[PDB]
C-alpha cells in the first residue's frame, strides 16, 4: 500500500512544476488535471501542494517519449502509461508521462487526471495496492462515476504515512 523502503517527505507544503505539455489538450486543461489530481490526496492528508513555473520544484511533471535520461524508457502507444519516483531530492518525487499516448479529459483512453492521480501516489511514497477498486491498483481501468473522491483504501494508505 505504501511505497517500500518507507521513504517519505518531511514537510507538508510541497511545490510542483509542469515543465512541458501535450498537444492533445490545452495548457489550461493540463494544469487543471494536475491540480485536481493533487487535490484528491490533499483533502485526505496534511499535504498542501503549490505550483511554480520556474525554479526547482519538489515534484517535476513532464511528457517524454522513449528514452528520456533516467534509464527507464517508455514504450510507444499503450503499455506503460507513465511512471514516478519515490520521495527524495533530485529526481525523487518527479513524475513522467508517455508523450506517445492519447491524453484526454474524458472516459476515452487515457484520462490524464486519473493517471496523474495514480502517479502522484508514488511521488508521495505509496506502493501498489491489491485492492481492485483502489486508485493504486497496478492496472488502469476507467470507472464511470459521480463521486470524485479517493477510494477508502488510498485514504488509509496516505494517512498511514502522513497522518
Ligand atoms: N472517473 C474518474 O474520473 C476516476 C474515478 C473517480 C475519481 C476517483 C477514482 S480512483 C480510480 N482508480 C481507477 C483505476 O483504474 N486505478 C488503477 C490505476 C489507475 C491509473 C493507473 C494505473 C492503475 N496504473 C498505471 O500504470 C497507470 O495509471 N479508476 C478510476 O476510475 C478511479 C477513480
Ligand atoms: Ca524532485
Ligand atoms: Ca506507452
Ligand atoms: Zn522517466
Ligand atoms: Zn503504479
UniProtKB/Swiss-Prot annotation:
Protein name, per record: Neutrophil collagenase
Domain free text: The conserved cysteine present in the cysteine-switch motif binds the catalytic zinc ion, thus inhibiting the enzyme. The dissociation of the cysteine from the zinc ion upon the activation-peptide release activates the enzyme.
Function: Can degrade fibrillar type I, II, and III collagens.
Binding site for Zn(2+) 1: 68, 70, 83, 96
Glycosylation sites: 13, 105, 147
Binding-site positions, Ca(2+) 1: 58, 90, 92, 94
Compartments in which it is found: Cytoplasmic granule; Secreted, Extracellular space, Extracellular matrix
Active site: 119
Similarity remark: Belongs to the peptidase M10A family.
Source organism: Homo sapiens
Gene this chain is encoded by: MMP8
Tissue: Neutrophils.
UniProt binding sites for Ca(2+) 2: 75-76, 78, 80, 98, 101
Binding site for Zn(2+) 2: 118, 122, 128
Parts forming coiled coils: none
Amino acid at each position: 500500500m505504501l511505497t517500500p523502503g518507507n521513504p517519505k517527505w518531511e514537510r507538508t507544503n510541497l511545490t510542483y512544476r509542469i515543465r512541458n505539455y501535450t498537444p492533445q489538450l490545452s495548457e489550461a486543461e493540463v494544469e487543471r488535471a494536475i491540480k485536481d489530481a493533487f487535490e484528491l490526496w490533499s483533502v485526505a492528508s496534511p499535504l498542501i501542494f503549490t505550483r511554480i513555473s520556474q525554479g526547482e520544484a519538489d515534484i517535476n511533471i513532464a511528457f517524454y517519449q522513449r528514452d528520456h535520461g533516467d534509464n527507464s524508457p517508455f514504450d510507444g502507444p499503450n503499455g506503460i502509461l507513465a511512471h514516478a519516483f519515490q520521495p527524495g531530492q533530485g529526481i525523487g518525487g518527479d513524475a513522467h508521462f508517455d508523450a506517445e499516448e492519447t491524453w484526454t479529459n474524458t472516459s476515452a483512453n487515457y484520462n490524464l487526471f486519473l493517471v496523474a492521480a495514480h502517479e502522484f501516489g508514488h511521488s508521495l511514497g505509496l506502493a501498489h495496492s491489491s485492492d481492485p477498486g483502489a486508485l493504486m491498483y497496478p492496472n488502469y481501468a476507467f470507472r464511470e462515476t459521480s463521486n470524485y473522491s479517493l477510494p477508502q483504501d488510498d485514504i488509509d494508505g496516505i494517512q498511514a504515512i502522513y497522518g
